[PDB]
RNA sequence: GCAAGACUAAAACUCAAAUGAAUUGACGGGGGCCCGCACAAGCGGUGGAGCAUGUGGUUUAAUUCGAUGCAACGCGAAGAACCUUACCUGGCCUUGACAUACUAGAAACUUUUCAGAGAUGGAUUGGUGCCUUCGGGAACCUAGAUACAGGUGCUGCAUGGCUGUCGUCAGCUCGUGUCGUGAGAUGUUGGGUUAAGUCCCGCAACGAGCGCAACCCUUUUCCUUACUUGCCAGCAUUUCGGAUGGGAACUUUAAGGAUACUGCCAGUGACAAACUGGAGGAAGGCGGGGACGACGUCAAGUCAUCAUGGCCCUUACGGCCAGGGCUACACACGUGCUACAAUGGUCGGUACAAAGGGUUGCUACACAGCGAUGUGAUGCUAAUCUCAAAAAGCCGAUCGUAGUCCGGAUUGGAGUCUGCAACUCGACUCCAUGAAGUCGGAAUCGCUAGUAAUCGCGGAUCAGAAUGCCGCGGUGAAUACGUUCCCG
């Protein structure tokens, strides 16, 4: 059957929202649309910067965008010109002054989006899908996750009949709401069409609940 | 939606915005009781002579991302498909799965 | 939830607006300056009336 | 059920006579949750029988219920004690429905008096069940 | 050999198999066991009538497209008069309504008109702006050119993503060791128990994961913090209105905690897991409800949300416009609403909710109107003002079983409001009219408790347009002996 989104089901339990601002019903829609435009623009621009998470806040008549990346130098620029250009672009898009902040990820193999992007890049570069899946799973398990599942769907290898292949190591307790499950999806565009990649990573059980998380 | 339909919607919003002030002025003149009957009749004639796209009733709410004309949800400005996707990703502040 | 036809297949979402009220009486001189110097945290809207 | 035995649902005594029999009769009379209308219908009969012939309202109703009580199902089987009252109440409601008077309460009281004296569609139906029992 | 026939006994031609034993599944009108509103016991419906709505068919210029047993048919559509719109008739444009790359000129814009159904086209005003290493540049518009744009065109049987279904079914797997030539087997089987592969015992097996349960939300009892816009027990003043001084008690509002664990007693179980009964406690063995849906199955659904391989069109299968259609009507089906009355209809008087919405909005109050509503005016960005009248209920009168003082379809005549515009084709109001309908065959559906039944209230979509959908409270049942058969 169909499965609920692992992040959406925990959005109020052990997971925090990616947007943090208040707006009355008159500007909620405009704020949300500009936020979505910002996310799309950043996703396109920092494609090679190894960016996974974007957090948008609107503290007081302004904006703050925190970008979590494994390539802080490439995001920042040679002398910091790139973050200034990003601030200009984001201010132009959002209509309010915006501040960019950088959060450096020191363990890329425990981040679901980065693994999915790596696997999709391998598939587009025509590495055998089973080899890519097992390499990613082994790398994450060496990095220290307590479980990882990787799934690929589509015309795997160019076959005319599409199918789905998955591989899992460790523990992935999807039905435990307090489990820390990072989830990500990505598309690989090949000559024969689209291949979908899904990654689940389990990093232990969070105790104390949202009070512990400090919502 | 098609690019033609999206551009049609944009042009209609532009016309409504361009003619917003004069339409309100004519409607106020029509509602005026101190104004002459001839004045109110002329105001009605001018209102009927305005371009059709100046009327806000011809605007249709469309998804801000895809242009879908069904299932709009005024509060978010997105149709149901993109709303479901964004909410379950966690990019919509405050919205969570509801149970009671 | 379905893209085409399943009327019984829906997600039910909710959003809550919480409100709190604080009253300050006999305000000292430093009170207003301290309140204005207090930082504005994202996600909370603060309205002050005198 | 299948595996469980469901505990019988105990209903409270009526707040006027403290009589579970009268409460069950009221429940049988009542339609779509209108308890007050059924209360009026039953209490009108209980007060009117007292005026017409002086007996205790509870005792007179119990005696008539015992009179209308059957004792055989349908392959013959005896009715358990609960179904005796359950079937007598339904018969007394259905039959009292069809007599013609101004109010339902007056019809109910009229057939209560009638069944006390051995005439009523209720005890015709009881004798019909008796006939069918003698058949097998 | 009486006969029926027996015995001896080929070839032409034709196929790439035909066979034996054993393994794993699937099935059996084979055998054991168990569960589920499956049956049984009950209470209400559908199938009959009128209307609403969807579908098939038929019709049409078009009646746009998709969904088709359960699992399509108040489905996509959380809302087709124009728009939406994808369809038809007719009128128009051609690097195009939209993007990137190139070459030139103009600020952009703005006023008045005229022709036209409009799309469009032509005359006619003002403005001609922002930076500047200032020789030009930033938008923005117009003109030329070609690579291209564009396509709700085809393929869901090339795909991603998303969803339904079996089914909230209790199952589905893996490593080392043993047995077998082998596919495989064992473990996971065997005895009790449970809502559950839930738990406890035995055993060539010894060890793990995903599933079950719990963690999350809501409701029932209590405590702490908090005392306004909410509250009023005690005091005082009152126009008897928490109205006013005042109080922080109570209700409530909403954050954080406490409690329930077979904890105590009795009996059984096997001397285990478990099971039955009792006290206390608001609550007792899973207290109630929500969310959460394993491995897999159906080339299930969706190229018309979107993305995407491939195919096809390019003065047209692209784009703009006005009018029409999606609302047709000999018919058939599905899902609903309203009734057929006295446990009721009408009239008069009088009580008791919850939840949600409101600044392009909701409106106190007054006046006008029979009314829908109109005008003036007031408070509210809301525990502050408002939608707002809860309705069934209770008391009194009347109707007296009649197609009626039941029912409210249809049609005639007047209006109101939204909207540029209610003919096709809106909702509502008033007068007149007053249809079928007398409780509905075979068959079939929902429901085990605050449930069914019945009564009203709100919202999403939305200018206007719900009997649908998603929620909220009020009143409040009947019956479960049991698993013999119906189904799974
Ligand atoms: N309207 C038009 C729709 C056309 C449709 N799109 C064609 C299509 O998809 N053909 C597929 C395709 O060539 C390939 O399948 C994939 N996936 O590429 C192939 C692999 O077997 O199968 C074919 N399909 C088949 N169906 C057949 C079946 O059952 N038996 C016999 C043989 O005719 C089978 N081949």
From Swiss-Prot, chain B:
Claim: Transmembrane helix is one of the keywords in the record: no
SUPFAM superfamilies named in the record: Glucocorticoid receptor-like (DNA-binding domain)
Gene Ontology BP, a term: translation
Keyword RNA-binding: yes
Gene3D superfamilies xref list: 1.10.287.1480
Keywords tagged on the record: Ribonucleoprotein, Ribosomal protein, RNA-binding, rRNA-binding
Gene Ontology CC terms, in alphabetical order: cytoplasm; small ribosomal subunit
Domain of life the protein comes from: Bacteria
Signal peptide (UniProt feature, chain positions): none
GO molecular function: rRNA binding; structural constituent of ribosome
Pfam families xrefs: Ribosomal_S14
Function (record text): Binds 16S rRNA, required for the assembly of 30S particles and may also be responsible for determining the conformation of the 16S rRNA at the A site.
Subunit structure: Part of the 30S ribosomal subunit. Contacts proteins S3 and S10.
PANTHER family: 30S RIBOSOMAL PROTEIN S14, SMALL RIBOSOMAL SUBUNIT PROTEIN US14M
Family per record: Belongs to the universal ribosomal protein uS14 family.
Protein name as catalogued: Small ribosomal subunit protein uS14
Organism: Acinetobacter baumannii (strain AB0057)
Swiss-Prot record, chain D:
Gene3D superfamilies: Ribosomal protein S7 domain (1.10.455.10)
InterPro entries: Ribosomal_uS7 (IPR000235), Ribosomal_uS7_bac/org-type (IPR005717), Ribosomal_uS7_CS (IPR020606), Ribosomal_uS7_dom (IPR023798), Ribosomal_uS7_dom_sf (IPR036823)
Record carries keyword Zinc-finger: no
Recorded GO CC terms: small ribosomal subunit
Pfam families the UniProt entry points to: Ribosomal_S7
GO molecular function: rRNA binding; structural constituent of ribosome; tRNA binding
Top-level taxon of the source organism: Bacteria
Keywords, alphabetical: Ribonucleoprotein, Ribosomal protein, RNA-binding, rRNA-binding, tRNA-binding
Signal peptide region: none
One biological process term in Gene Ontology: translation
HAMAP family: Ribosomal_uS7_B (MF_00480_B)
SUBUNIT field: Part of the 30S ribosomal subunit. Contacts proteins S9 and S11.
PANTHER family named in the record: RIBOSOMAL PROTEIN S7
Family: Belongs to the universal ribosomal protein uS7 family.
Job description of the protein: One of the primary rRNA binding proteins, it binds directly to 16S rRNA where it nucleates assembly of the head domain of the 30S subunit. Is located at the subunit interface close to the decoding center, probably blocks exit of the E-site tRNA.
The name this protein goes by in its record: Small ribosomal subunit protein uS7
Biological source species: Acinetobacter baumannii (strain AB0057)
